[PDB]
Design an enzyme around this catalytic site. Sequence first.
Site, mmCIF file in Angstrom:
data_model
loop_
_atom_site.group_PDB
_atom_site.id
_atom_site.type_symbol
_atom_site.label_atom_id
_atom_site.label_comp_id
_atom_site.label_asym_id
_atom_site.label_seq_id
_atom_site.Cartn_x
_atom_site.Cartn_y
_atom_site.Cartn_z
ATOM 1 N N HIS A 149 0.781 -1.269 -0.159
ATOM 2 C CA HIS A 149 -0.180 -0.037 -0.037
ATOM 3 C C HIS A 149 0.904 1.312 0.094
ATOM 4 C CE1 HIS A 149 0.688 -0.188 4.519
ATOM 5 N NE2 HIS A 149 0.695 1.120 4.372
ATOM 6 N N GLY A 172 3.687 6.398 9.743
ATOM 7 C CA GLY A 172 4.926 6.138 9.269
ATOM 8 C C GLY A 172 5.516 4.841 9.769
ATOM 9 N N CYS A 174 4.554 1.910 9.236
ATOM 10 C CA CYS A 174 4.086 0.935 8.271
ATOM 11 C C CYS A 174 5.610 0.134 7.703
ATOM 12 C CB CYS A 174 3.316 1.213 6.957
ATOM 13 S SG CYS A 174 1.471 1.350 7.631
HETATM 14 C C1 LIG Z 1 -8.038 3.184 10.506
HETATM 15 C C2 LIG Z 1 -7.643 3.654 9.274
HETATM 16 C C3 LIG Z 1 -8.679 4.063 8.448
HETATM 17 C C4 LIG Z 1 -6.012 4.460 9.087
HETATM 18 C C5 LIG Z 1 -7.075 2.267 8.385
HETATM 19 N N1 LIG Z 1 -7.917 1.259 9.176
HETATM 20 C C6 LIG Z 1 -8.560 0.321 8.341
HETATM 21 O O1 LIG Z 1 -8.581 0.323 7.078
HETATM 22 C C7 LIG Z 1 -9.310 -0.679 9.045
HETATM 23 F F1 LIG Z 1 -10.496 -0.492 9.615
HETATM 24 F F2 LIG Z 1 -9.304 -2.205 8.489
HETATM 25 F F3 LIG Z 1 -8.553 -0.961 10.112
HETATM 26 C C8 LIG Z 1 -5.612 1.705 8.297
HETATM 27 O O2 LIG Z 1 -4.935 1.131 9.041
HETATM 28 N N2 LIG Z 1 -5.073 2.198 7.171
HETATM 29 C C9 LIG Z 1 -5.713 2.856 6.239
HETATM 30 C C10 LIG Z 1 -5.163 1.968 4.930
HETATM 31 C C11 LIG Z 1 -3.626 1.240 5.379
HETATM 32 C C12 LIG Z 1 -3.634 1.651 6.957
HETATM 33 C C13 LIG Z 1 -2.689 3.040 7.138
HETATM 34 O O3 LIG Z 1 -2.729 3.854 5.938
HETATM 35 N N3 LIG Z 1 -2.182 3.058 8.315
HETATM 36 C C14 LIG Z 1 -1.062 4.214 8.599
HETATM 37 C C15 LIG Z 1 -0.261 4.472 7.441
HETATM 38 N N4 LIG Z 1 0.903 4.725 7.650
HETATM 39 C C16 LIG Z 1 -0.358 3.848 9.912
HETATM 40 C C17 LIG Z 1 -1.357 3.952 10.919
HETATM 41 C C18 LIG Z 1 -2.068 5.352 11.194
HETATM 42 C C19 LIG Z 1 -2.071 5.547 12.691
HETATM 43 N N5 LIG Z 1 -1.008 4.578 13.367
HETATM 44 C C20 LIG Z 1 -0.684 3.690 12.313
HETATM 45 O O4 LIG Z 1 0.052 2.771 12.513
HETATM 46 C C21 LIG Z 1 -4.803 0.269 4.673
HETATM 47 C C22 LIG Z 1 -5.682 -0.530 5.341
HETATM 48 C C23 LIG Z 1 -4.268 -0.021 3.271
#
Ligand SMILES: CC(C)(C)[C@H](NC(=O)C(F)(F)F)C(=O)N1C[C@H]2[C@@H]([C@H]1C(=O)N[C@H](C=N)C[C@@H]1CCNC1=O)C2(C)C
EC number: 3.4.19.12
Lengths: 301, 301
Positions: B41, B143, B145
């Site tokens: 992603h 950040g 990820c």
């Molecule tokens: C809750 C949210 C809407 C953000 C989403 N959640 C669900 O989609 C769920 F509902 F399935 F959980 C979610 O996690 N993401 C959105 C998206 C990835 C991930 C994401 O972009 N994450 C952040 C990227 N750096 C790191 C996060 C932010 C705070 N602290 C962390 O570590 C993907 C599932 C592809």
Amino acid sequence: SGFRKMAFPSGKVEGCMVQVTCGTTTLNGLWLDDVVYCPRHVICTSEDMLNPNYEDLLIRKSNHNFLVQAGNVQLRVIGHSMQNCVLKLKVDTANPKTPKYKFVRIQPGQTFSVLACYNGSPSGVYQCAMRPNFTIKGSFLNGSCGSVGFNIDYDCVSFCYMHHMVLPTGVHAGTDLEGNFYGPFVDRQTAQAAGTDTTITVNVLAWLYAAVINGDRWFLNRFTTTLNDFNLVAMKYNYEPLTQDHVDILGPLSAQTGIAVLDMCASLKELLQNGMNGRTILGSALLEDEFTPFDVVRQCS
Amino acid sequence: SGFRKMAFPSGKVEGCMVQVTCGTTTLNGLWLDDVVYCPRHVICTSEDMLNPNYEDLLIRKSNHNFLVQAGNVQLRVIGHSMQNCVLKLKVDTANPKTPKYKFVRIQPGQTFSVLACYNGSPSGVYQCAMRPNFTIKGSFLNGSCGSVGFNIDYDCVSFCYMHHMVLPTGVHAGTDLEGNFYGPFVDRQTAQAAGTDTTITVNVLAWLYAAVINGDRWFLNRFTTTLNDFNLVAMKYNYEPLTQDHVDILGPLSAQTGIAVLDMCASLKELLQNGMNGRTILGSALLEDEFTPFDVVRQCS
Ligand SMILES: CC(C)(C)[C@H](NC(=O)C(F)(F)F)C(=O)N1C[C@H]2[C@@H]([C@H]1C(=O)N[C@H](C=N)C[C@@H]1CCNC1=O)C2(C)C
Ligand SMILES: CC(C)(C)[C@H](NC(=O)C(F)(F)F)C(=O)N1C[C@H]2[C@@H]([C@H]1C(=O)N[C@H](C=N)C[C@@H]1CCNC1=O)C2(C)C
């Protein structure tokens, strides 16, 4: 998202861990530049621990009586000295993995990461805090002497702790890297009292601030409290008295959550007198006091 | 002496952490040999997260659309692919700090150390466990990820986890190093259910064994229990059913403490039905379930 008791990356410290063997006693050392630091009780046998005269004991030891093993490469000892309770063994080869470092005496309440060296090598890392009685609640078995506590500022390692002994209660005592013990403890096998272990109040408030940032708000009350009245219920529950400095350190968490410091102390007063009623805060049923306000700020940004 | 939730030394993993920047999105990667692993992603913008077609999204990306930064040295991307949810970016230069490693899919209940990479670099390390719902209760901000979970056997690193997303409950989900998610989760921004989070029963028993070794015995009761009757009160309290395999894994702790497994389960039944009455075990008022019996054996020897 989420709150954990994480420690600094121990990569810079693992390259400085060595084995010091004096006679039949072995323990860990700190190889910085061309000097190796280790607890001076490495020169004691099983009998000397009861009443050691380290000066008389070190006099009967020479440079060659110290086996300094860095993985597999042995280090030649060209000198030795005794700075309080630490043994400074000057070696010929300087450590190529020597990071930017300095020595610092940590105040009670501050936290640091500990690289526990079980079985003669770096084995685990954990985060702990210096209790008001200058002890720590860690994990140290036989062979853990020489394990070091440290903090990392970007590229500089701040070595602050070295493990020496374990109190009969099971808690641990140690010195700084200049040999001076934290507290009234002495490297000698004898019953030593630790003193009253009060709770770091400023750390508890910082942990409650971290709970608000992470979503937990059930403990947020509808009262307020002054500073002297909060300290009145603080001494009753073995909590350290809050000072105006402690209020200033909690500055960034109050401005980030919109909750004043005195309002947070008002909530904390209710948790002490009413308990948690089985509820949890950040997954714990105890007021956690191993998070300084700087640790919370680091993790929540 | 003393019991702590310590993690493995992260020195071998810090040398493999890199920054992967695709467009305006940045996150951490794993540089092993001449391949960089990161969540797929990274190629998505703020809009694509709602309904991403990663195949169509990756087709519009080329080798040069990936900025792989290892500290300061940039890596030239000569190839890319998509193995399930992980992005394998083949680079020209092999990592000189590549340790002996292998990939492993971890079973629920097993623990591992996580090198959380805040602010674009290795920032902290903590020990966690794979919950039965295949989520973890960690600490991950924006950040984070690309943060990896791992275990270390002497010299071999067993990479088992990589963080991807955070559930709306705040818990975290991720994949193995071959791209397959732990659980029924998919890299897509949408409400996903985690399922019932039961308690790892074998880990709780291992933690009670660690309490006996460390001196805490107040919970040791004067009763016994069969395996089926303990599982009867286990399902009522959202505890996993104990199997004869779990009894065998707890073998070394029963032989070391002289307390049979079924006798330990008898004690645990009383703690569930009567609570702790405010008392503490190893400094905690909750049955801790983030210690596998192998973790207790490692720390208690
Ligand atoms: C809750 C949210 C809407 C953000 C989403 N959640 C669900 O989609 C769920 F509902 F399935 F959980 C979610 O996690 N993401 C959105 C998206 C990835 C991930 C994401 O972009 N994450 C952040 C990227 N750096 C790191 C996060 C932010 C705070 N602290 C962390 O570590 C993907 C599932 C592809
Ligand atoms: C309780 C004991 C009688 C052992 C003693 N305690 C007190 O003297 C006290 F009562 F003051 F605490 C004590 O700690 N030591 C005896 C002696 C040093 C230290 C010691 O040899 N320690 C072990 C050495 N490797 C490591 C320990 C063992 C288990 N886990 C560890 O980490 C010195 C104070 C010079």
